[PDB]
Each structure stands twice: as structure tokens, then as C-alpha cells.
């Protein structure tokens, strides 16, 4: 019920797992289905997209995003598709640092739209970088999901709450 893959870090401007068509096929991934990244440490839950620079068993992810997930280049991880995922009605997040907060305040334009373009699956304590515009990104930490769940999927109607 999954596949072992090698983690490859990239400079992609999103938090998605970029997968080769072979894996999307083999794993029988469904639209917006979450993927559990299982390892020696605590699992993480990611959103995925089909990479356009492939064509086996390699999963690409932004370097900074991957490190925050406790991943290292070349690590062997087990991708386990999640049969189901609850849709987030509300999500609460806070900047990783005071600087992030200050940047957000001066770059707080439709944060949720930028968020959705770069990440769709969230889980408590997830820490990820989100570009707010061409020049700037901020690190945010997902604090809470509503309904309560180990992981969830962000939607266009998800209420996004930001605290300092």
C-alpha cells in the first residue's frame, strides 16, 4: 500500500511532493489525495503534483520544505497514500518568527490564495515557507485544523486565521 522512494531536493516554489507519472500511476493517486511520508521519525502529510521533468521511485520537494519535514537528500522514505482526508473548514496559523510576522504585515495581500497555490495538505505543527509575492516568502506554522484531524485539505472556502 505504497512505495519506497528517494528524496530529491529542489528549488520549486511550493510545498508539494513532485512525482513521476509512474508513481502517480502505481500508487493509484486520486485528485487531491493526501500522501503520508513514513520514515524512522514521525510521519508528515503532503499534497502532490505530477512532475513535468521526469520519465522512477524518486520524489522531489523544495529543499527548505523538506528539511522542516525532517528529510535529507537521498533519504529513503515510504509514500503511503491516505484513503481519505477531511476538508478544512478553518485553519489557524502563525508566523514562525517576529520577522516573518513583520514581513507578513507589509506583504499581507490575499495570503490564502498564495497559500493554496503552494500547499493543499496541512497538519498540526507543520512549518512551511510561503511566497507572498515574487520577492518574498514567510515561514508559517500550522497551529490548528477544523474539524480536528491529524491532517487536512485546504480549500478555496477554507477560513484562514492568522495570529501574530
UniProtKB/Swiss-Prot annotation:
Family: Belongs to the AAA ATPase family.
Functional summary from the UniProt entry: Component of the PEX1-PEX6 AAA ATPase complex, a protein dislocase complex that mediates the ATP-dependent extraction of the PEX5 receptor from peroxisomal membranes, an essential step for PEX5 recycling. Specifically recognizes PEX5 monoubiquitinated at 'Cys-11', and pulls it out of the peroxisome lumen through the PEX2-PEX10-PEX12 retrotranslocation channel. Extraction by the PEX1-PEX6 AAA ATPase complex is accompanied by unfolding of the TPR repeats and release of bound cargo from PEX5.
Subunit structure: Homooligomer; homooligomerizes in the cytosol, interaction with PEX6 promotes dissociation of the homooligomer. Interacts with PEX6; forming the PEX1-PEX6 AAA ATPase complex, which is composed of a heterohexamer formed by a trimer of PEX1-PEX6 dimers. Interacts indirectly with PEX26, via its interaction with PEX6.
Cellular localisation: Cytoplasm, Cytosol; Peroxisome membrane
Top-rank taxon, per record: Eukaryota
Protein name: Peroxisomal ATPase PEX1
Comment on protein domains: The N-terminal domain shows evolutionary conservation with that of VCP, and is able to bind phospholipids with a preference for phosphatidylinositol monophosphates.
Amino acid at each position: 500500500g505504497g512505495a519506497v522512494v528517494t528524496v530529491a531536493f529542489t528549488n520549486a516554489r511550493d510545498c508539494f511532493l513532485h512525482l513521476p507519472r509512474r508513481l502517480v500511476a502505481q500508487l493509484h493517486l486520486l485528485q487531491n489525495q493526501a500522501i503520508e511520508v513514513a520514515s524512522d521519525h514521525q510521519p508528515t502529510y503532503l499534497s502532490w503534483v505530477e512532475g513535468r521533468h521526469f520519465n522512477e521511485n524518486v520524489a522531489e520537494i523544495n529543499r527548505q520544505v523538506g528539511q522542516k519535514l525532517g528529510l535529507s537528500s537521498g533519504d529513503q522514505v515510504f509514500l503511503r497514500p491516505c484513503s481519505h482526508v477531511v476538508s478544512c473548514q478553518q485553519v489557524e496559523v502563525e508566523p514562525l518568527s517576529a520577522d516573518d510576522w513583520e514581513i507578513l504585515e507589509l506583504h499581507a495581500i490575499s495570503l490564502e490564495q498564495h497559500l493554496l497555490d503552494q500547499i493543499r495538505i496541512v497538519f498540526p505543527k507543520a512549518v512551511v515557507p510561503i511566497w507572498v509575492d515574487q520577492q518574498t516568502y514567510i515561514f508559517i506554522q500550522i497551529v490548528t485544523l477544523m474539524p480536528a484531524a491529524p491532517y487536512g485539505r485546504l480549500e478555496t472556502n477554507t477560513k484562514l486565521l492568522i495570529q501574530p
